[PDB]
Design a protein around this ligand. Structure first.
Ligand SMILES: *C(=N)[C@H](C[C@@H]1CCNC1=O)NC(=O)[C@@H]1C[C@@H](C(F)(F)F)CN1C(=O)[C@@H](NC(=O)OC)C(C)(C)C
Ligand SMILES: *C(=N)[C@H](C[C@@H]1CCNC1=O)NC(=O)[C@@H]1C[C@@H](C(F)(F)F)CN1C(=O)[C@@H](NC(=O)OC)C(C)(C)C
Lengths: 304, 304
């Protein structure tokens, strides 16, 4: 038992991290098969970051403008034999296929979904943590200068689903990056100009999963017979900075195991959102929305 | 910027995990050089777990009573050529030295200290998270059947300091394990009998580090000129379920960078411990004590 902020083991992804350098700029890249992905702003001089012309930067480069080095594990310098831009990312083709390429897919995550991040500097992993894609299409990470190209991913069995490449910090503790189609989460621009963000909201479905996790760990003081329908809750949520609730099979399994209906926990949220009044749930005095239904099913019941 | 629950990259330790089987019992072990460490209760039949005689169990075993298998990465079956007991752990000598043994030390952590845990089942890593050794010598983990032998560790540079091998769950979400001298944290017995725990307390020095992290991320509404001396705070702490505060160089660096004295934050704790009254600090409505001064210095300032 117990519910914690859990990340995937990072070793499989550590074996794919490289350092990418373009002139005076350096960051991290992801080496899969014969391709190295990295943020395109590695091509931009500091003095042009406020108004880059990435199309012009790209044509000013040759294959030799990029240097790709693997430091950790099996060391190596990889020769770039091709270069292309896709959205906010570069795709560098290298002459050697990564012998440690895992089974992988590329996916784009949705608000409320959780993924593991491997934070790296100079091609060297330094930490791992789990984030939730916020309703305003940012993440609340921990990233310093040089962290771009750090990757986020989920895992289904042995398959790694890469979903995030770190790009920028929009405000204190507020970050965004690209999916591997090159689209920036939240459509923010990789240019150094202030860009307003939407207000953050509570992820209602994750709050429900966490309340179920509480029931499963012996904490149910907030469960009453009262119920609020999904439709009624969703009108309320839009007026109170909560996301609209969408049920899933994963949530249904928790309702079955506990015998507590989703609608009872929606009612509870409407009472608890103003404060627990000295009471606590799983050691917290506020609603927690960083645990997904899938995370709860996995940690508490072993079920995937 | 940003402060999150961060763990070390786990790849170096993943390469050291094995499965250890003794009869009908199986769990994880740690393979370093020619030694495999694992919990001694792998020798105990389920029907004797409430009153084991580990000295008698050990003499009833031969080297062949243990089977050690590595599943992930470089697979292998390791032949046991020696077996010994140290405290609550077994030390099995195997015929092959782990070619991926990192530089390592063994250390015993203190309340308030944080470490990374690699949770494993059947010799296969499944997740990683960071815990703090609680003042009552438990950890708040996430562990299911089969998780014993999962390891906790810190890292100083490239050196891994192993400090924890998972042994048991004492209550919901409440865990303990061994240091690698074989001593159980909190002196709990590896026998299946209820064992009372001391009450948990807030780790005051980590609360101070987190308040400094708040100041560094633009949040200082709780800072006032008022001060409380360490001596005065420590008498108060013993009456209010807080640990006694011990300053360190790591804390002093945060006081210097922010210009806010430790004694100002000790006063703040005495006002905030009853509730923030609708206000928030780093997105929380309660004091947080899972971030150490070292963690804060590292994540926010890059400094080790
Ligand atoms: C990649 N190494 C960094 C990561 C950034 C550094 C501080 N904390 C982080 O997460 N990425 C950048 O520096 C980008 C690159 C430039 C651009 F995005 F291409 F324009 C500027 N970057 C920013 O992150 C800026 N943020 C911003 O302009 O938001 C509108 C700041 C943080 C001002 C450099
Ligand atoms: C190792 N695989 C497990 C881990 C345990 C399982 C449930 N969640 C966990 O963290 N360890 C055990 O099952 C130990 C082994 C026995 C003994 F410690 F050697 F006696 C019993 N174990 C327990 O954890 C028991 N806890 C206990 O008796 O506390 C006093 C329970 C959880 C009742 C099996």
């Amino acid at each position: 038992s117990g519910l914690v902020k859990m990340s995937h083991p990072s070793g499989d992804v550590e074996a794919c991290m490289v350092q990418v350098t373009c002139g005076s700029m350096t960051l991290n890249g992801l080496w899969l098969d014969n391709t190295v992905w990295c943020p395109r702003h590695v091509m931009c001089p500091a003095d042009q970051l406020s108004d880059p012309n990435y199309d012009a930067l790209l044509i000013s480069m040759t294959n030799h403008s990029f240097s790709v080095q693997k430091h950790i594990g099996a060391p190596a310098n990889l020769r770039v034999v091709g270069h292309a831009m896709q959205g906010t990312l570069l795709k560098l083709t290298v002459d050697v296929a990564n012998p440690s390429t895992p089974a992988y897919t590329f996916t784009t995550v949705k608000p409320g979904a959780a993924f593991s991040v491997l934070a790296c500097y100079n091609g060297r992993p330094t930490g791992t943590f789990t984030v939730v894609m916020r309703p305003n299409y940012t993440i609340k990470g921990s990233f310093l200068c040089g962290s771009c190209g750090s990757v986020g991913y989920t895992k289904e069995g042995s398959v790694i689903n890469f979903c995030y490449m770190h790009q920028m910090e929009l405000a204190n503790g507020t970050h965004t990056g690209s999916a591997f189609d090159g689209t920036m989460y939240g459509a923010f621009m990789d240019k150094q100009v202030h860009q307003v963000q939407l207000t953050d909201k509570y992820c209602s479905v994750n709050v429900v999963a966490w309340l179920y996790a509480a029931i499963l760990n012996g904490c149910a003081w907030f469960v009453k017979p009262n119920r609020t329908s999904v439709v009624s809750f969703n009108e309320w949520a839009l007026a109170n900075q909560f996301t609209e609730f969408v049920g899933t099979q994963s949530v249904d399994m928790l309702a079955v195991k506990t015998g507590v209906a989703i609608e009872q926990l929606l009612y509870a949220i409407q009472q608890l959102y103003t404060g627990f009044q000295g009471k606590q749930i799983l050691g917290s005095t506020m609603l927690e929305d960083e645990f997904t239904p899938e995370d709860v099913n996995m940690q508490i019941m072993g079920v995937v």
